[PDB]
């Protein structure tokens, strides 16, 4: 049976139903004669449900008939979502016709259980040398991504999409939480021109939308990533800002009249973070690994939104302007990026010794660069000058050409395995390649390509 709208205050709509046909929590409702969808938040009693509209409420009146769908918001899933832009309801927002899906899934489900955890600490190879050496990724892991704009974030995301599609036979889902419309059109045309659009499903929840759309858009993209995980694959899930997901939860909790918690946040802050982050795991069928960019409010790490977010993150990647001004791409800071997988029980002793040796040589070069800046090159000893030469060779060997950046560098891209990265950086750290010049170590793949670069 259908209901009637009894109250419209903003985006909050109360709909009255008969008493034996009250719809469930998180059920999708449809207003008759209009293209408006509602999501049930609360059951108030006497048949009246309190819901959030998934669009504009301008022009709605009391007395309109509302149909119940019998289920939660159901999005198209499968191979037909690849190459397509979608909203939070799964409707296409590119002008390319209907999605020809074979299956629709609801966006609310539980986390995978304790017996469904895959076990171990298996690494996800990205093919990027600085990521697979300094801050390694786990399958099922979570990556915080830091830095501003113009230092190569989008190029790193397209290279991760291309590498997980071609070398590991997996897929990618982008979920833009609070997506600016100009940058989403730019990102769509950049992924058409880099031939990586058909490897990723795009879901946008834009900035000019009411905040329940911006709250549920990551659940929509995670549902498509769960279908890709349940076909036996290893999936990447990109979240454009996790702080806008947190702020959309603050806005939706302020619209329902909940009593606010400390520093203005919603009282269900850790629970709404945990419902999203516990579904991103490694299971017995496949894994979803997430890359999420993080904004920090007021440069305060002890603010409740980054303190709730950093409890779920397994690695951080910090992007730097000073590495990008030296011409080194990708611009990952090797001293500021951290990982929980950088541990000799997880990755073995050999990888840990090579990565901590590279980090000691770059830290000693960082303080000796201020020594050379304060007093000149003649203050340093023979061992200090030898470490400066090895450190510049290490610093140039961290750079790598990318397949999606072949317009920029003018070179073919390279995929480097983890074995070649540990062997090459061990070969620089043991002094095996002190006879090469430093400019042979710039923008190659393995250490053998630097050896053939130093003959030309």
């Amino acid at each position: 049976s259908s209901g009637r709208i009894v109250q419209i205050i903003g985006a909050v709509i109360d709909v009255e139903f008969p008493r034996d046909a009250v719809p469930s929590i998180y059920e999708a409702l449809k207003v008759q004669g209009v293209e408006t969808t509602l999501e049930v938040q609360q059951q108030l009693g006497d048949g009246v449900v309190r819901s959030i509209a998934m669009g504009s409420t301008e022009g709605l009146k009391r007395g309109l008939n509302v149909d119940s769908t019998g289920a939660a918001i159901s999005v198209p899933v499968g191979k037909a979502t690849l190459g397509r832009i979608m909203d939070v309801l799964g409707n296409p927002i590119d002008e390319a016709g209907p999605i020809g899906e074979e299956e629709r899934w609801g966006i609310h489900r539980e986390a995978p259980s304790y017996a469904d955890q895959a076990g171990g600490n298996e690494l996800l190879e990205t093919g990027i040398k600085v990521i697979d050496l300094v801050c390694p990724f786990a399958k099922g892991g979570k990556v915080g991504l830091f830095g501003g704009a113009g230092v190569g974030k989008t190029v790193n995301m397209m290279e991760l999409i291309r590498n997980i599609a071609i070398e590991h036979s997996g897929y990618s889902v982008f979920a833009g939480v609070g997506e600016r419309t100009r940058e989403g059109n730019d990102f769509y045309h950049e992924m058409k021109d880099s031939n990586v659009l058909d490897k990723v499903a795009l879901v946008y929840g834009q900035m000019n939308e009411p905040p329940g759309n911006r709250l549920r858009v990551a659940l929509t993209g995670l549902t498509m990533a769960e279908k890709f995980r349940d076909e036996g694959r290893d999936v990447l899930l990109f979240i454009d800002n996790i702080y806008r997901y947190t702020l959309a939860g603050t806005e939706v909790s302020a619209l329902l009249g909940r009593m606010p918690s400390a520093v203005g946040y919603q009282p269900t802050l850790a629970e709404e973070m945990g419902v999203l982050q516990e579904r991103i795991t490694s299971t017995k069928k496949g894994s979803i690994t997430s890359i999420q960019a993080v904004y920090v409010p007021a440069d305060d790490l002890t603010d409740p939104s980054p303190a709730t977010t950093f409890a779920h993150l397994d690695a951080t990647v910090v992007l730097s302007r000073d590495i990008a001004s030296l011409g080194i791409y990708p611009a990952v800071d090797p001293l500021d990026s951290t990982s929980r997988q950088l541990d000799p029980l997880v990755i073995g002793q050999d990888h840990y010794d090579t990565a901590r040796g590279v980090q000691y040589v770059l830290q000693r070069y960082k303080e000796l660069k201020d020594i050379i800046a304060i007093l000149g090159m003649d203050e340093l000893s023979e061992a200090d000058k030898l470490l400066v030469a090895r450190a510049r060779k290490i610093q140039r060997f961290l750079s790598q050409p990318f397949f999606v950046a072949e317009v920029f560098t003018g070179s073919p891209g390279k995929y480097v395995s983890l074995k070649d990265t540990i062997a090459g950086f061990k070969g620089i750290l043991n002094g095996d390649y002190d006879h090469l010049p430093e400019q042979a170590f710039y923008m190659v793949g393995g250490i053998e390509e630097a050896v053939e670069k130093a003959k030309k």
Binding site: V6, Q7, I8, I9, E58, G59, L60, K61, R62, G63
Partner: protein, 68 residues
Amino acid sequence: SEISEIIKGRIEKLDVASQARNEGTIVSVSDGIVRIYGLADVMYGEMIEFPGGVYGMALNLEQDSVGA
């Protein structure tokens, strides 16, 4: 039902106004907010005509009142 016939005949002669769905009556005025009984067909964001050429906009469509 348990309503008697004489009581029903007293009910049918009551003076009850027929409230049109596009019409309403002002209940309260405070601080630029006018709360109105009625107006059962008003939309969210619809203009409301008051006497003297004054106009308003409906923002709170509650169960028994409209805040404009």
